[PDB]
């Protein structure tokens, strides 16, 4: 007994596995934290891989690094397929930890409460925000995705504005924006998905390379971190209680 989540955003037999675990220190007065695994390719059917992922054992250790507090993660496993998966890696503690409550330099076992597997396109079909940085040397506008959630327990609405890219826009194009916010673009934002990875991960399907999507490989998935906006939240609480209700955008003059 453990909740499991499988999101197949790609139909390929081969896919990029984006795996996030919500865990609880094995202890009285336990720390609660969320771990995401560095992305890895697999060809095992998703509904089968999730059974293997669910059966691993996880240990963490809080350490100090030039970046601040980090979490060393170790994953134990008897499943042959998970030779494919990183078993030692480090993640930022501020996003990972809810809380207190974890000691430094003590390897700590954690009980798995939930495991989420999202299937994305192959790594050569994934575009990041960093990928698009420096593509425009003199941009005039920033493009922001406004990710709207409902907290299902409180009924409160939450909007997380996340940076996508900066572009240059011709004066002529400002009057309707139809050459920037193309039909392709607007549809891609409206139908964008938010999945449990890196805290939360926005995934935009890039159907064209015109306007707002210039210099992106067509049919790539453009992936965007929201974890940096969730440092003060419990990720498990978020992935359980924040329902993604819409995605809007703003094209803001740089100022």
Curated annotation (Swiss-Prot):
Disulfide bonds: none annotated. It comes from the Viruses. This is Matrix protein. Its main location: virion. Pfam families: Matrix_Pneumo_C, Matrix_Pneumo_N. The modification Phosphothreonine is found at residue 205. Changing residue 172 to A: About 80% loss of host transcriptional inhibition activity. Residues 2-110 are annotated as: Interaction with M2-1. Belongs to the pneumovirinae M protein family. A motif (Nuclear export signal) lies at residues 194-206. Changing residue 170 to A: About 80% loss of host transcriptional inhibition activity. Residues 110-183 are annotated as: Nuclear targeting and binding to host importin KPNB1. GO terms for biological process: virion assembly. It is found in: Virion; Host cytoplasm; Host nucleus; Host cell membrane. The gene is M. Plays a crucial role in virus assembly into filaments and budding. Early in infection, localizes in the nucleus where it inhibits host cell transcription through direct binding to host chromatin. Later in infection, traffics to the cytoplasm through the action of host CRM1 to associate with inclusion bodies, the site of viral transcription and replication. During virus assembly and budding, acts as a bridge between the nucleocapsid and the lipid bilayer. Also plays a role in the inhibition of host interferon-beta response in a RACK1-dependent manner. Phosphorylation is important for oligomerization. GO terms for cellular component: host cell cytoplasm; host cell nucleus; host cell plasma membrane; membrane; viral envelope; viral tegument.
């Amino acid at each position: 007994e453990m909740e499991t989540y499988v999101n197949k955003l790609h139909e390929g037999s081969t896919y990029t596995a984006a795996v996030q675990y919500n865990v609880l220190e094995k202890d009285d007065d336990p720390a609660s934290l969320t771990i995401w695994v560095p992305m890895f390719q697999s060809s095992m059917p998703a509904d089968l891989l999730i059974k293997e992922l669910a059966n691993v054992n996880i240990l963490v250790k809080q350490i100090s690094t030039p970046k601040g507090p980090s979490l060393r993660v170790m994953i134990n496993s008897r499943s042959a397929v998970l030779a494919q998966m990183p078993s030692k890696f480090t993640i930022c503690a501020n996003v990972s930890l809810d809380d207190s409550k974890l000691a430094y330099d003590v390897t700590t076992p954690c009980e798995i409460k939930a495991c989420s597997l999202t299937c994305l396109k192959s790594k050569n079909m994934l575009t990041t925000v960093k990928d698009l940085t420096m593509k425009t040397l003199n941009p005039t506008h920033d493009i922001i995705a406004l990710c709207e959630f409902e907290n299902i327990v409180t009924s409160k609405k939450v909007i997380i504005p996340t940076y996508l890219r900066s572009i240059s826009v011709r004066n002529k194009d400002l009057n309707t924006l139809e050459n920037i916010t193309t039909t392709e673009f607007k549809n891609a934002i409206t139908n964008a998905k938010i999945i449990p990875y890196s805290g939360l991960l926005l995934v935009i399907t890039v159907t064209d390379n015109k306007g707002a999507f210039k210099y992106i490989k067509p049919q790539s998935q453009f992936i965007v971190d929201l974890g940096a906006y969730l440092e003060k939240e419990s990720i498990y609480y978020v992935t359980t209680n924040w329902k993604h209700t819409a995605t809007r955008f703003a094209i803001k003059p740089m100022e």
